[PDB]
C-alpha cells in the first residue's frame, strides 16, 4: 500500500513553503501531514524505514545543510525532528536510498556546485563523504540500480548537462555512461523495470515535456512518450509499477497536477489536479 509524499518547494505565494501532502493513488485522496519546521524550496526528500527525510534546500536566505525527519507512524499527529546535518549545504541536490542509507549528491551551496556525494546512516545519525563526481552538478537526480548509483544531467553553473555519471561501489569512483539525447536540469528521475526514466526539465532555452529512458542492460537511451505538459523542477517517483511526474513549473505556471506513465498503455494520464501548486519540491514513497 504505497502513497506519494510531496514536501516543501516553491509555492504560488512566490516563496518557499512548508506544506507536506500525501496522495493515495488508489483512492485518489489527498491529505495534509504535519508541515516541516523550516520552509524549503530546491529541496530533496527520501523515505527510509518508515521515516520521511527532508534534506537541504533553500529557505529564501541560505542554502541548507540541515535535515528534518518525520516518523511515519500509524497514530498520526507526528512531529518533525532535526537530525544530523549534511557535510555541505545543498540546494537542488539529488537523493536516493540504498539499503539502510541515504545518498545525496551534487547541489549548490550558494557559491559552488558540488562534485561531492555523501551518505547517511540513521542508526549512527551521521553523514560521511564519498567520491567526488567528475562534473559538479545541480538539478541532477540520483537513482540506484543494481547497487550502482547514477547522477544524471543537471547544471554545472555554466552549461546544462546531458552527461550521466555512475558510481561503482567496487572502486568508489564515478565514471561516465552514455549521455542523454537532451540536456536537462530539474528533470524528474526514477527507476522502472530496469530503465531510468528522465522526465521534463529545462534544456537552457525551453521547459521540456519530453521523456527519455536509459536501458541499463544496454547502456543506451530511447525516446518515451512525451508528458501532457512541460514540467521543470518536477519530482518523479514509481509506485505499483507506474511512473508519476509530480507538479512542477511549466515555464509559465506552477502546476498542481500529477500525471502517470503507465507502460501498459505507453502514455501519460493526468490522474489528479488537486495538489498544492509548487515546484522543486521533494517527493518520496511511503507504505501504509
Amino acid at each position: 500500500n504505497e502513497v506519494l509524499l510531496v514536501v516543501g518547494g516553491f509555492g504560488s505565494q512566490q516563496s518557499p513553503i512548508d506544506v507536506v501532502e500525501k496522495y493515495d493513488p488508489k483512492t485518489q485522496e489527498w491529505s495534509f501531514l504535519p508541515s516541516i519546521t523550516r520552509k524549503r524550496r530546491y529541496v530533496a526528500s527520501v523515505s527510509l524505514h518508515d521515516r520521511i527525510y527532508v534534506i537541504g534546500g533553500y529557505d529564501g536566505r541560505s542554502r541548507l545543510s540541515s535535515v528534518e525527519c518525520l516518523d511515519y507512524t500509524a497514530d498520526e499527529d507526528g512531529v518533525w525532528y532535526s537530525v544530523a546535518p549534511m557535510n555541505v549545504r545543498r540546494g537542488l541536490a539529488g537523493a536516493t536510498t540504498l539499503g539502510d542509507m541515504i545518498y545525496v549528491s551534487g547541489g549548490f551551496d550558494g557559491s559552488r556546485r558540488h562534485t561531492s556525494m555523501e551518505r547517511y546512516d540513521p542508526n549512527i545519525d551521521q553523514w560521511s563523504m564519498l567520491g567526488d563526481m567528475q562534473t559538479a552538478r545541480e538539478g541532477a537526480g540520483l537513482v540506484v540500480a543494481s547497487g550502482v548509483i547514477y547522477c544524471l544531467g543537471g547544471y554545472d553553473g555554466l552549461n546544462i548537462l546531458n552527461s550521466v555519471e555512475k558510481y561503482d561501489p567496487h572502486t568508489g569512483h564515478w565514471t561516465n555512461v552514455t549521455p542523454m539525447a537532451t540536456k536537462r536540469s530539474g528533470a524528474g528521475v526514477a527507476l522502472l523495470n530496469d530503465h531510468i526514466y528522465v522526465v521534463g526539465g529545462f534544456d537552457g532555452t525551453a521547459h521540456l515535456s519530453s521523456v527519455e529512458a536509459y536501458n541499463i542492460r544496454t547502456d543506451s537511451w530511447t525516446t518515451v512518450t512525451s508528458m501532457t505538459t512541460p514540467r521543470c523542477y518536477v519530482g518523479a517517483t514509481v509506485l505499483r509499477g507506474r511512473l508519476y511526474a509530480i507538479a512542477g513549473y511549466d515555464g509559465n505556471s506552477l502546476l498542481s497536477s500529477i500525471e502517470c506513465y503507465d507502460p501498459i498503455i505507453d502514455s501519460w494520464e493526468v490522474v489528479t489536479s488537486m495538489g498544492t501548486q509548487r515546484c522543486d519540491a521533494g517527493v518520496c514513497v511511503l507504505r501504509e
Binding site: 516553491f10 537542488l92 545541480e138 538539478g139 530539474g186 529545462f202 521543470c232 523542477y233 513549473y249 506552477l254
Partner: peptide, 8 residues
C-alpha cells in the same frame, strides 16, 4: 530563484 528555468 536564479536557477536555470525556475520561476522568477
Amino acid at each position: 530563484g536564479q536557477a536555470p528555468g525556475a520561476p522568477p
